[PDB]
Amino acid sequence: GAYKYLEELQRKKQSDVLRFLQRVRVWEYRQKNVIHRAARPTRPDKARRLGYKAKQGFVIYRVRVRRRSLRATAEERVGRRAANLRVLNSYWVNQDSTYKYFEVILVDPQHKAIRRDARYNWICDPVHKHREARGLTATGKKSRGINKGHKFNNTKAGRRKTWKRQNTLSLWRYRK
Amino acid sequence: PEYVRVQRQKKILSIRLKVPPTIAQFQYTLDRNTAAETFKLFNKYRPETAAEKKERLTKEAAAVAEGKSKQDASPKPYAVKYGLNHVVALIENKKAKLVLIANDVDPIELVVFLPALCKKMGVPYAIVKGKARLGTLVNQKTSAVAALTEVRAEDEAALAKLVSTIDANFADKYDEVKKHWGGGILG
Amino acid sequence: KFVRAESIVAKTLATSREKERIKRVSILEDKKAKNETQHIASGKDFILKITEGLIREKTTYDGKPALLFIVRVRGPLAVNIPNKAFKILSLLRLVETNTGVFVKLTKNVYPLLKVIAPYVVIGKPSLSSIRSLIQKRGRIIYKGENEAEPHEIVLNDNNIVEEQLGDHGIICVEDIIHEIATMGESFSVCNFFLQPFKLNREVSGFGSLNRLRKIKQREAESRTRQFSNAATAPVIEVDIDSLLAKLN
Amino acid sequence: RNFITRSQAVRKLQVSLADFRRLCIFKGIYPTFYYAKDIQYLMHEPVLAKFREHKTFARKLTRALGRGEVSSAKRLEENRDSYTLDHIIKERYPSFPDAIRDIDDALNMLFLFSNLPSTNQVSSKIINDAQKICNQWLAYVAKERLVRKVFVSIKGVYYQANIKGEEVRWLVPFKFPENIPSDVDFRIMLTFLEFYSTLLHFVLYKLYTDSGLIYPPKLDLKKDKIISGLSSYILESRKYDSPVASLFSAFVFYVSREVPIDILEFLILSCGGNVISEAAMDQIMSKVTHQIVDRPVLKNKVAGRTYIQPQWIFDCINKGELVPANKYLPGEALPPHLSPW
RNA sequence: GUUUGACCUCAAAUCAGGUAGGAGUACCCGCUGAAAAGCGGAGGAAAAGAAACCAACCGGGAUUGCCUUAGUAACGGCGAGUGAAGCGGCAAAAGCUCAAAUUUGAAAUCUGGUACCUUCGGUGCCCGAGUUGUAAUUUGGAGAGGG
C-alpha cells in the first residue's frame, strides 16, 4: 500500500517539497479562520495511525493556535466549539512563527454508523465526555506523564496525590 | 466573498514561488488526441456499476432459484483498476500495463512518488488531466489514479501502440524539463 | 476551421467501400440485364421483410409494378455520397433528408434500389398511411395570382387540383390518394404534382431527455438496417405503417 | 393580501414559472394578481412535488449523460414515476354531469390536435393519442346514433350530441394540411391537451362502462389499414330515440371516391346505414340504392341508383326528416343552408 | 463550443433527523493558584490498566487497593525535618482492538428515505457516503498463502 510512502516522505519535513507545501498551506490556512472544518486529512496516514476512518461520523477540524501545551489547548478549543462531537485525537501539520496548526479528529456518537460498528461504539459512552477537558487524550496523558518506568515518578497531580498520602492517616479497629 | 478571493489568490502564490521539480511534472501532461484515445480505450474497459452488478446477480440467482443451473463458465471480468492502494498494489509485482495519474489532488503528496515509482519499476505511467474525468470512467466522483492490467486479445495490439505513443509523447518530451524547478515568476 | 486528421481518413475509407459495392452492383446488374449469367452469384433477386432478434423473411422479386413509399434516411457515418447515387437521389428528390416519395416498382426500377439502399428505407405502405400523409402533409409548387413564383401551397383547394388536372379529369385530392393507391390510369401525373414531401425529425434531440431517445433509436436503427455490400443484397422492407406512426 | 405578484407566488412555491403556468391552467387557478388562499391551497400538492422531483431527475439525467454512463440513465428513465392528473379531475369535477357540461371545450382541442400534422414540438405520440381518443369518441356516438344537429361551414363542422342531458358542441376541422402558425406557443395548448386528454379519458371510461361494453375498443388492423376512423374499432357487447337515430334505417349508401369520406361516413353511422366507398374498394354493390356524389357528369347513370349531392344528408338530419332530392340531384342548385342556430 | 457538462469549493434553506448548554457537585480527573479559593469536565464510581515494566535472582509478570517494606533509602543553611520504591503476604483478577504488504475473479461496507413486517429491530427498493478505502482476514504470544 501507499501509506508507507507517505510515512517515509513525512519523516523528511525540511525537504524541499514538504517545506514548499508547508509554506503554501500556512498562508492558505492563514486566509481562513482560527477553527474550521477540513474536508479531508492532509496527512491521512497519521490520521489512520491515530484512528481515522473515512465514513460518516468522522469530522476533521483544522485549528490555529498562537505560539498547558499548545496541542492540548488546540484540542480544548474544538472540544468547546463542537460539544456534540467527541474528540478522538489530534496531530501536528504545520506551524508559523505566529501560529501552530493542528488537525483534529472528532467523532460523533449520534450517527448510527458510530452507534453500531462495535470497533467504535465505546465512544458513545458518557464517560467519554470531553476527554480533552480531563486530559484523557494522548497529549493529555503525555502531559500528565502516565506510563510505566522508574523515569516516571510522582509528578504534578500525582504529587498532590502523594501529598494526599502524607495528608491522610489510616487507623484500624485494632491499632497496629 | 472570501472563498472566491482565496481561490483566485491560490495558483498566484504558487507560480510566484519556486516549485520543487518533483512537482510541475504535473501539468506537463498528455496532449489532446492522445488523452482522447486513452479515454476511448478506457471506456472500452469501464468497470461494472452497482446496478449492473446487482442486475446480473439477480439474473443468475433467479436462474439458480429455478435451477436451471445453466453452466459454470465465465472467463474473467476485465476492468480498469482505481483504488489508490490497489493501484500501488498492482505495481511492485508489476502488473500495471498503463497508469493514469491525475494532476490535481489537494493532498498532492498522496501522488508524488508515483511518477518516480513507475519510472523505476519501468511501468508506462502517464499524467492525466483531471481526477473527475478519472471518476467518470470508473463510476466514482473522483479517482486520481487509473491502473489497467488485463486486456482482451482484440485490444492488446492497441494497448502496445498506445504505450509506445505515450513513451514517445511523455517520456521523451518532458523528461529533462521534469528535473527543472518550475514556477518562481511573479504575478 | 482546422477540420481534423481522422474524419478525412474515415470518409475516404467509407467512400472506398461504397464505390466498391456500387461497382459490384453495376457489373452484376449489367450481366443480368445483358443476360450473360455465366459466373455470378445468383440469377434472380430477393427482398427482405423485417417484422417482429426479429423475424426477417425473404421473398423472390415479382416483376410487377408495386407502389412503394421511399423514406430518405441519414446516410452512413462519415460518407461522401458518390455522384452515381447522387444522380439518382437528385432525380428522386431525396436530398434534404427525412423526405420520402411514392414510386412505381418495375424491373427497370428495381436495379437502382440495390444502388441507393444504404441511404433510404423501403416497405409496403397502406391506404390509411398514404391517406394520412396526403391529408396531413404535402405542398404543391404553384403558379398563382401574382407571384415571383417559387410558391408552394398546402392541399386545400380541390378546384386548384381539377384546374391543372382537368385534362386527365382529376379532381379532389382524395382521388389523388385513390389513384396513387390505384395507379390504374396515371400515377406519374400525381407523382410529379405532389413533388415535395417533408417529414419531421422524430426526436427533438438537444436536451437531457431526448438524447436517450436518440441513443435508443440509433440502436434500433442498427438492429433494423443491414448493409450487405454483396450486390446480391435482398431488398430490405419495413413496416411503413409502423414507420409513419413515428414520423407522422 | 388579496393580490399576489406572479414572481412572489412562484418563489414562495419554489416552482419554475412555466410550470406555475402549467399548474394555474391545470387546477383552474385564475387571477399578476392572485388570491392568497388559492395559493395556500396550491401550497401542498403532490404534483408540484413530482414536478420538482422531475427537475432533480433531469439534473441526475444530465450528470448521467455527462459522465457518459448510458445504462444508469436507462435505469433512471425506466425507474421513473409519472405524475398523473386524475385526482384533481375528480375533485374538480365530482359530479359527472359537470364533466358532461365541461367536456365541450375538452373535445374541441383534442379534435384539432387530431387534425394536426406531426411536428417537433408536438410529438406524434401526442397526435396518436389524440386521434385514437377522437376516433373512440366518434365510435361511441355511432353506437347510440344520437346526435341531432349538423352544421356545414368554412369554419369547421359543428355537431352537438344529445347525450345524457345537454347537447355537446364539438367540431372537427377538415383533414387538410395546415400551415403551422409561428405566432402560437404550443406550451399552453399541450397543457390543455393533456388535461382534456386525461379528463375525456375517464369520461370515456364512464360512458363505455355505462353503455355496458368494454372500455378498451378493439380494432381489426386490416380494417384500420382500409381507413383510420371510428369504423376501424369493433365495439363489443359486455331503443333508438326517434327519429334521428335510425333515420334511414335499412338504407344502403354508395358514397363515391369524390366525396369527403369522413364526415359523411360519420353521418351515415349516426343514421345506422351502411357505407360503401370505392376509395376503400381499391385497397383490396348489390344492395346500393343511393350515390352521394358531387360531380357534374355522372358516368354509368343507373336509373335504379339515386344520385344525390351530400347536402341532402346535411339537411335531412338538421330537420330529422326526409326531403325530396331533386335539389340534391346533380347538377341542380341548392338552397343556401342556414343551420338551426 | 460564445454551448453544454463533470467535478471541487463556498453559501443558503421556518428542509429532515439529532445533539451542546443549566443545576448539583461527598468521591473522581484536568487547569490555575495564594496567604485553600477558583475554573473546567464526568460517572456510579472516576482514574489507571495489559510493560519501550521490575529486576539481577533458582527471576518476576496488566492495573487497583490493604498490611509489611519504613520512618528505611534518599533529600534537606544534611537545620527545621522532608520522605519513597523493588520484593513478600492478601483482596481482586481478564483480557483485547487498530494502524503495515490487493478482494481485485467483481465495495464484498454503511447512513438516510420509502413500502411492508413479528419494531431497542428486520426485509425490499431508491438515493446517497465511500477507492484521498468502507467490509472480511492479520496485531508478534506472530501471522499470511498454499499443500
Side-chain angles (χ1 to χ4, degrees):
Chain A
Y3 290 93
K4 192 172 179 69
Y5 298 129
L6 268 67
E7 184 175 0
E8 186 66 32
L9 184 140
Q10 186 64 39
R11 290 187 179 180
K12 300 294 184 180
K13 297 180 178 67
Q14 288 176 358
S15 62
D16 300 331
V17 47
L18 276 81
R19 58 92 55 82
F20 180 76
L21 269 66
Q22 190 268 335
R23 189 178 64 192
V24 171
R25 285 167 181 173
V26 62
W27 178 75
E28 182 178 359
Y29 299 156
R30 181 69 173 85
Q31 302 295 316
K32 292 177 71 68
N33 289 316
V34 175
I35 297 169
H36 56 85
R37 190 174 190 267
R40 61 182 65 252
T42 60
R43 291 179 57 193
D45 52 354
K46 183 67 182 179
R48 292 293 182 86
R49 66 183 67 255
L50 293 184
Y52 175 76
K53 294 291 184 182
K55 63 186 178 182
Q56 296 181 357
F58 289 96
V59 175
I60 296 298
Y61 277 181
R62 185 178 294 118
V63 60
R64 171 171 75 192
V65 288
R66 188 176 175 88
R67 286 192 174 181
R68 295 189 299 274
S69 74
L70 303 178
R71 184 176 177 184
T73 306
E75 295 185 355
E76 288 176 353
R77 297 294 176 89
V78 291
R80 287 177 178 175
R81 183 175 176 84
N84 50 355
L85 273 289
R86 264 73 171 277
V87 176
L88 180 64
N89 209 353
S90 67
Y91 63 102
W92 180 71
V93 286
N94 191 350
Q95 67 184 359
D96 195 358
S97 67
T98 314
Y99 297 113
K100 293 182 180 178
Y101 287 159
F102 290 96
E103 203 174 11
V104 180
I105 170 64
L106 295 89
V107 178
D108 191 7
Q110 304 300 319
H111 195 276
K112 294 293 180 183
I114 306 297
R115 299 181 64 80
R116 304 175 191 178
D117 287 329
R119 290 181 181 89
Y120 297 98
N121 56 0
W122 58 269
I123 204 167
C124 295
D125 190 1
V127 307
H128 297 91
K129 289 179 180 180
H130 298 283
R131 299 174 66 194
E132 75 282 11
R134 299 173 294 176
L136 296 173
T137 67
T139 180
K141 289 175 72 173
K142 184 176 180 179
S143 294
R144 290 172 72 191
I146 300 168
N147 284 315
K148 288 190 281 184
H150 57 274
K151 182 179 178 181
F152 296 94
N153 291 318
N154 286 318
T155 58
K156 182 69 176 175
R159 181 67 171 85
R160 188 179 65 194
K161 176 181 179 181
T162 190
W163 180 262
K164 179 70 175 179
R165 184 176 178 178
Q166 297 298 105
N167 212 167
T168 305
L169 188 64
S170 180
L171 298 175
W172 293 94
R173 290 184 290 166
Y174 300 99
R175 300 291 174 83
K176 295 173 74 71
Chain B
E2 290 183 356
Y3 72 100
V4 178
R5 179 186 63 84
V6 175
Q7 75 181 359
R8 293 179 188 176
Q9 282 178 356
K10 192 175 180 180
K11 192 177 179 179
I12 294 178
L13 195 277
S14 178
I15 299 171
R16 187 176 179 180
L17 275 67
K18 296 290 290 183
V19 315
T22 184
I23 314 168
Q25 53 180 358
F26 307 98
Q27 91 193 3
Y28 292 163
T29 180
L30 192 57
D31 50 352
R32 184 255 178 186
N33 205 168
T34 311
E37 291 295 323
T38 309
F39 286 155
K40 291 182 175 68
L41 181 66
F42 285 182
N43 282 111
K44 296 176 183 179
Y45 283 166
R46 300 292 291 273
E48 190 178 7
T49 74
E52 294 171 352
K53 182 177 176 182
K54 186 178 181 182
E55 183 177 2
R56 191 186 68 242
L57 290 171
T58 52
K59 292 183 186 293
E60 302 181 358
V64 178
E66 295 183 358
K68 203 64 62 65
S69 68
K70 294 179 179 177
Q71 74 270 13
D72 291 332
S74 294
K76 273 182 73 175
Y78 290 180
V80 295
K81 278 86 163 59
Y82 66 105
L84 187 144
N85 301 121
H86 186 198
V87 163
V88 175
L90 286 176
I91 321 168
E92 299 176 353
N93 298 125
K94 65 192 78 175
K95 291 183 181 181
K97 264 63 188 299
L98 286 178
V99 175
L100 285 184
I101 290 169
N103 50 358
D104 50 352
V105 174
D106 195 3
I108 309 169
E109 64 188 5
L110 294 167
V111 194
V112 294
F113 53 87
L114 294 165
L117 192 141
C118 294
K119 178 74 173 179
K120 192 171 180 67
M121 290 300 291
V123 177
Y125 71 104
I127 295 170
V128 77
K129 184 181 282 184
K131 57 182 175 295
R133 299 180 64 84
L134 294 176
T136 54
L137 55 89
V138 81
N139 314 323
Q140 299 292 320
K141 287 188 286 186
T142 64
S143 178
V145 285
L148 183 132
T149 292
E150 291 295 324
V151 172
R152 278 89 50 87
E154 50 86 20
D155 192 81
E156 188 71 32
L159 181 63
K161 286 181 180 179
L162 186 61
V163 169
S164 179
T165 304
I166 292 166
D167 295 333
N169 276 308
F170 192 82
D172 296 328
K173 295 293 289 183
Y174 295 157
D175 49 357
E176 49 87 18
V177 71
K178 185 177 176 180
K179 295 183 181 182
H180 293 91
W181 291 82
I185 299 170
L186 282 76
Chain C
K1 291 184 184 182
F2 178 84
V3 179
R4 256 116 193 90
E6 303 93 3
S7 64
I8 187 169
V9 177
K11 288 180 182 179
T12 308
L13 296 172
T15 51
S16 70
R17 292 181 180 87
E18 287 295 323
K19 289 174 186 179
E20 283 172 350
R21 57 89 51 84
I22 281 166
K23 285 284 188 178
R24 283 177 285 170
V25 167
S26 68
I27 296 169
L28 187 141
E29 286 175 348
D30 283 330
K31 291 181 181 180
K32 284 189 176 184
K34 288 184 178 181
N35 287 314
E36 50 187 357
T37 301
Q38 303 300 318
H39 292 84
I40 58 170
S42 182
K44 287 183 179 180
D45 301 334
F46 294 100
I47 290 169
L48 188 146
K49 292 179 173 69
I50 169 68
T51 54
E52 295 177 353
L54 294 174
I55 46 174
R56 299 178 293 112
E57 295 175 352
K58 284 176 64 171
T59 61
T60 61
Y61 176 72
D62 185 1
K64 184 175 181 178
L67 191 273
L68 296 174
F69 183 68
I70 201 66
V71 176
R72 170 74 180 180
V73 185
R74 183 178 182 179
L77 287 309
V79 180
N80 292 319
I81 38 101
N83 198 11
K84 182 179 178 179
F86 177 73
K87 184 183 89 280
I88 301 164
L89 298 168
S90 304
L91 286 174
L92 300 177
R93 298 182 298 274
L94 300 175
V95 77
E96 184 62 31
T97 64
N98 303 115
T99 298
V101 74
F102 292 98
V103 289
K104 180 174 181 180
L105 174 60
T106 58
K107 293 188 286 184
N108 197 2
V109 170
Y110 189 78
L112 301 176
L113 297 171
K114 287 180 177 290
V115 175
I116 62 172
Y119 297 103
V120 290
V121 71
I122 322 170
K124 293 293 183 181
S126 168
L127 178 62
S128 297
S129 299
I130 301 164
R131 183 185 299 277
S132 301
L133 283 174
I134 298 167
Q135 76 187 357
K136 293 172 76 174
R137 291 172 185 270
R139 289 90 173 96
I140 312 300
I141 187 67
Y142 182 71
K143 187 260 186 180
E145 175 64 28
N146 195 358
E147 293 170 351
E149 211 266 326
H151 196 273
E152 292 173 353
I153 297 173
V154 291
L155 293 172
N156 311 123
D157 196 3
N158 299 320
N159 303 115
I160 284 176
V161 169
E162 68 171 357
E163 176 184 1
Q164 292 175 353
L165 303 174
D167 291 329
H168 298 284
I170 305 305
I171 312 167
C172 63
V173 192
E174 177 64 29
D175 287 345
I176 301 171
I177 306 170
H178 180 74
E179 292 169 351
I180 285 173
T182 300
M183 304 167 71
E185 293 181 353
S186 293
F187 175 76
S188 300
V189 176
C190 303
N191 195 0
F192 283 109
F193 185 74
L194 269 296
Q195 184 169 3
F197 276 160
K198 289 181 180 179
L199 300 175
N200 58 351
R201 286 165 285 174
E202 56 189 359
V203 170
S204 178
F206 298 154
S208 68
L209 192 275
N210 304 317
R211 292 177 186 175
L212 302 175
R213 298 175 180 174
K214 288 178 92 288
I215 294 167
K216 289 182 179 181
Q217 284 176 351
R218 288 178 182 177
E219 293 165 351
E221 287 175 352
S222 69
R223 290 181 297 169
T224 56
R225 287 192 299 272
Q226 295 176 356
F227 298 98
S228 299
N229 303 318
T232 54
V235 172
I236 293 170
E237 294 184 353
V238 78
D239 301 331
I240 309 174
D241 297 332
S242 176
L243 182 60
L244 292 174
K246 300 293 182 289
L247 270 76
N248 208 168
Chain D
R1 188 176 292 173
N2 191 12
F3 288 160
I4 290 177
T5 306
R6 185 178 67 193
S7 297
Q8 294 174 355
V10 81
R11 290 177 68 184
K12 183 176 76 174
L13 290 171
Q14 297 169 354
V15 186
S16 67
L17 195 147
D19 193 359
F20 176 74
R21 297 174 68 187
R22 293 178 179 271
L23 289 175
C24 291
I25 294 166
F26 180 63
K27 288 187 179 179
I29 295 169
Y30 286 161
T32 61
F33 300 99
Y34 295 93
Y35 297 93
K37 188 175 179 181
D38 296 334
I39 301 167
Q40 284 173 350
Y41 175 74
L42 187 60
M43 185 175 176
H44 60 279
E45 178 66 32
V47 181
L48 186 147
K50 289 182 174 64
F51 281 154
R52 302 179 73 185
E53 288 163 355
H54 182 270
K55 178 183 176 181
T56 62
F57 171 71
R59 176 171 56 84
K60 292 184 180 181
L61 181 54
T62 54
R63 73 178 65 196
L65 290 174
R67 295 173 63 82
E69 180 178 353
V70 178
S71 67
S72 69
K74 292 183 178 181
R75 195 270 308 271
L76 286 177
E77 177 62 29
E78 289 165 352
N79 295 320
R80 179 190 57 81
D81 51 350
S82 296
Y83 70 100
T84 185
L85 315 188
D86 295 333
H87 69 286
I88 73 155
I89 295 172
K90 189 173 182 177
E91 294 112 20
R92 184 171 178 177
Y93 290 153
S95 58
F96 182 69
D98 196 0
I100 301 304
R101 284 185 291 278
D102 296 330
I103 198 175
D104 204 1
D105 198 2
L107 288 168
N108 301 321
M109 294 298 289
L110 295 175
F111 284 119
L112 182 134
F113 282 104
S114 69
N115 198 2
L116 276 170
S118 66
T119 61
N120 52 2
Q121 294 185 0
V122 174
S123 297
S124 70
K125 296 180 181 180
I126 295 169
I127 299 167
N128 285 314
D129 297 333
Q131 290 180 355
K132 284 171 186 177
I133 292 171
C134 290
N135 284 313
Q136 288 174 356
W137 175 255
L138 293 178
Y140 184 67
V141 176
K143 177 63 69 176
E144 61 264 8
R145 302 175 189 177
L146 284 175
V147 297
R148 189 171 177 177
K149 294 292 186 181
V150 172
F151 174 52
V152 168
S153 54
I154 299 166
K155 288 182 180 181
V157 179
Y158 286 88
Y159 289 170
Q160 60 184 355
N162 45 8
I163 298 299
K164 292 181 180 178
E166 296 179 356
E167 290 183 346
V168 177
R169 298 187 296 271
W170 56 270
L171 75 152
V172 175
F174 290 94
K175 293 185 179 181
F176 286 157
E178 292 175 352
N179 289 317
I180 197 69
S182 65
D183 197 2
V184 303
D185 191 1
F186 287 158
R187 294 183 182 274
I188 303 171
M189 292 182 285
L190 296 175
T191 60
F192 279 103
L193 185 156
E194 194 177 3
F195 187 72
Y196 293 163
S197 300
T198 53
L199 191 145
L200 172 56
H201 184 279
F202 281 183
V203 174
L204 281 174
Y205 182 76
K206 191 169 183 177
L207 290 181
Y208 286 2
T209 57
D210 194 2
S211 55
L213 65 151
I214 299 301
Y215 171 65
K218 292 183 183 180
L219 62 93
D220 191 2
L221 300 176
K222 65 180 179 65
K223 287 183 179 181
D224 185 72
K225 287 183 180 181
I226 294 295
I227 180 63
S228 178
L230 72 157
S231 61
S232 172
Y233 293 114
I234 192 168
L235 280 77
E236 295 183 355
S237 66
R238 186 178 179 180
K239 294 182 183 178
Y240 287 153
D241 194 1
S242 297
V244 179
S246 69
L247 182 63
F248 304 108
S249 68
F251 197 88
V252 179
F253 287 97
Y254 185 77
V255 291
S256 65
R257 61 179 189 274
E258 192 274 330
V259 293
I261 183 63
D262 295 332
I263 199 69
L264 295 173
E265 179 186 4
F266 175 66
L267 283 180
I268 293 167
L269 290 169
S270 176
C271 293
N274 300 114
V275 176
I276 294 95
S277 69
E278 196 266 325
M281 288 293 173
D282 273 331
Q283 199 278 334
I284 187 163
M285 293 72 168
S286 65
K287 201 173 288 190
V288 285
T289 61
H290 281 70
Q291 283 186 0
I292 298 172
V293 71
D294 193 0
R295 288 183 64 184
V297 182
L298 204 281
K299 294 184 181 182
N300 56 2
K301 61 183 183 179
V302 176
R305 198 166 302 169
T306 309
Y307 296 149
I308 283 170
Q309 294 184 357
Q311 188 61 41
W312 179 62
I313 298 297
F314 297 118
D315 294 332
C316 284
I317 302 171
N318 280 319
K319 288 175 67 177
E321 296 297 324
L322 267 297
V323 296
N326 204 169
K327 299 178 184 180
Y328 308 106
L329 178 68
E332 296 291 325
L334 275 310
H337 178 76
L338 273 70
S339 62
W341 287 280

